[PDB]
């Protein structure tokens with residue numbers, strides 16, 4: 001019965017893969033989201049304007065007719081990356097942002113200084129990866145040893161702290177300035193590590209940064225519920241074939257594009273914070289990125305839908321996040 | 333190449349399953365170990381003397397010719413278990429010990445315990461008659477973080493239980509934390525513990541960095557490195573109330589590598605050489621025999637074995653998998669080169 005009408009959302013953190021997997025997964029995004037930040041961690045990564053242009057067109061080829069969907073491309077920051085290439089792609093409207101995955105930050109200072117100069121946002125997967133650092137500590141450690149020093153050196157740089165998973169990060173972002181923002185996935189709001197590990201190990205909940213203890217989940221839910229306007233929707237939908245997930249060494253990533261929007265609606269509703277839902281989905285991100293809000297509207301209805309058990313691929317299947325479960329809100 | 337001769341070891345914590353799986357896995361234990369504590373968590377559990385006798389015989393049936401192996405049976409403690417039944421199985425040599433799994437108010441009375449308070453008559457009887465209690469020491473309340481569940485058990489269940497029943501002999505099975513190592517180190521002659529090879533060799537990073545590794549997923553869950561190092565320090569100390577219990581806990585590959593992977597490591601094939609590796613790395617091989625072959629017998633009041641086996645420090649590859657009637661088992665350290673194996 002209950003219906004919620006919102007400005008059409010965008011997805012500020014998305015993995016669309018390539019080839020046949022791209023063809024399968026794009027429609028789950030393009031049907032709902034006006035735009036998405038398309039991450040560059042292909043094999044090999046998207047590190048040139050030419051590669052981004054070709055990749056954008058492959059994405060466009062896979063968008064069903066009638067979906068007004070625009071992929072916002074990103075550059076995978078590397079050592080060899082020429083700041084001129086990055087800026088050129090930015091000036092041509094090819095690169096919307098650049099993504100920093102965990103030789104060093106100091107090594108790419110010139111590139112980062114060009115981003116600061118030209119007003120290009122930096123998207124950060126904020127974990128330090130030293131073998132001596134416990135996997136649950138990697139996010140907190142990044143803040144202290146990389147994020148804060150970076151932000152102090154490059155005070156005009158716009159940074160999105162992607163897919164935050166900790167109270168540490170929530171507090172850091174809450175207390176930051178207008179040049180710092182964050183995305184939060186549906187899984188990090190809905191679950192904590194217990195959901196992944198109690199009663200069985202659930203690789204479909206295994207993703208990076210890893211699900212944390214419940215106090216961290218709670219800090220994230222409180223952050224979105226507060227109306228803080230520098231957190232916004234980023235699914236980190238990160239699809240892997242079923243048997244790459246269900247294996248002796250399961251890949252990290254939740255395929256949550258089919259279920260994310262309704263899952264977010266549930267969280268905000270549970271937090272008595274639906275008054276802040278639209279801004280999270282459809283306004284905060286555009287504002288931070290300096291892009292217009294979408295001028296179309298969609299409706300969610302509070303009617304239970306069962307999530308498919310699997311989605312066919314050319315070979316193997318894809319298991320969606322929440323496969324077989326019931327979702328409380330669906331897109332009308 | 334170095335040789336380590338030891339008195340034949342025993343495994344003070346083992347899952348042998350039943351049916352065809354039992355037939356497959358028994359030999360990995362019987363070839364090496366003189367005795368093993370056979371856990372009772374079959375479907376349905378072993379909660380009666382009659383079931384334990386029949387299960388014992390099925391295990392004996394599956395022992396290859398010439399292996400000198402004796403299964404030591406246990407009773408699964410449940411709300412509905414008659415203390416007279418437990419006592420009678422103990423008096424008749426059927427039950428060597430009883431096993432307490434985590435309490436849960438929603439458990440069927442025939443399959444487990446709702447609260448420890450609710451099985452006091454049975455625990456009192458065990459105390460009375462000198463039967464040891466083997467504890468899987470975790471609290472499983474939904475609001476407790478899985479990594480805290482062992483430590484929470486110590487405070488909430490173990491310490492009060494031992495304070496209530498002062499004569500009760502307890503094994504803290506498969507300890508995984510510094511909390512438990514400290515608690516056991518500081519306890520009295522009536523408290524002991526077992527430790528698995530995986531909890532000595534690995535921490536949670538090994539299960540989660542670079543990919544999720546269901547063959548390292550077991551309960552109690554692997555903990556932080558500080559906990560691993562505490563365990564290693566405990567065994568290497570020579571402390572004599574910690575002993576070998578593999579918790580070898582086999583599941584079909586398809587049940588491990590699934591959307592909801594079962595907990596347990598099939599470590600029977602590789603455990604003994606893995607313990608030798610750990611003790612050697614800790615410069616404590618002089619304590620290795622006692623851990624494997626002496627400390628458990630002394631705690632249980634049973635004789636030490638008077639035959640010997642030899643480990644040899646010659647590199648070997650572990651099988652990638654072991655065939656079952658249907659599907660396959662993936663052993664602990666599958667495909668790896670190990671340092672020590674049984675001659």
Ligand SMILES: NC(=O)N[C@@H](CC(=O)O)C(=O)O
Pocket residue numbers: 015041125206207208209236238239251252253254
């Ligand atoms: N989140 C994940 O667990 N995986 C992502 C990468 C990432 O966002 O770090 C992927 O591309 O597979």
Ligand SMILES: O=C1C[C@@H](C(=O)O)NC(=O)N1
Pocket residue numbers: 347373468549550551552579581582595596597
């Ligand atoms: O408590 C347990 C049970 C065991 C099993 O599978 O029997 N496996 C485990 O990992 N630990």
Ligand SMILES: [Zn+2]
Pocket residue numbers: 125162163208209
């Ligand atoms: Zn990331």
Ligand SMILES: [Zn+2]
Pocket residue numbers: 013014015039236238
């Ligand atoms: Zn990502």
Ligand SMILES: [Zn+2]
Pocket residue numbers: 468505506551552
């Ligand atoms: Zn156990």
Ligand SMILES: [Zn+2]
Pocket residue numbers: 345346347371579581
């Ligand atoms: Zn066990």
